[PDB]
Hints:
Elements (H helix, E strand, L loop, with lengths): L2 E6 L2 E6 L11 E2 L5 E2 L19 H10 L4 H8 L6 H11 L3 H8 L4
Antiparallel strand pairs: 1-2, 3-4
Helix pairs in contact: 1-2, 1-3, 3-4
The structure holds zinc ion (ZN).
Amino acid sequence: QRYLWQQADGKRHVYDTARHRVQAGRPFTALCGETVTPQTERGDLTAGLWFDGECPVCTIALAKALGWPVREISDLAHRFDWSPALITRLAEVLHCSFGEVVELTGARM
Ligand SMILES: [Zn+2]
């Protein structure tokens, strides 16, 4: 498995095992491009205690990276609430326009 989940900075992010090794107190850069530090006191190093919500940008980015059809990624995207900052970041990660992410994610408003 090239990609694994890892809770850090209050969300379950995904990371590329070819580029990072997870260690307590050490930063890594997740698929969403956020640099995050797992901490033992937050339960980050104990998988049975991962209670944070999933990182929406990492989730969508993982599906895209596993080669999902755009319709399926869209259904997946619809189960998150997308702030404008989340749309912008996903746009940067998918390397597409803001308008295409709005369409993909069903973000209204
Ligand atoms: Zn993330």
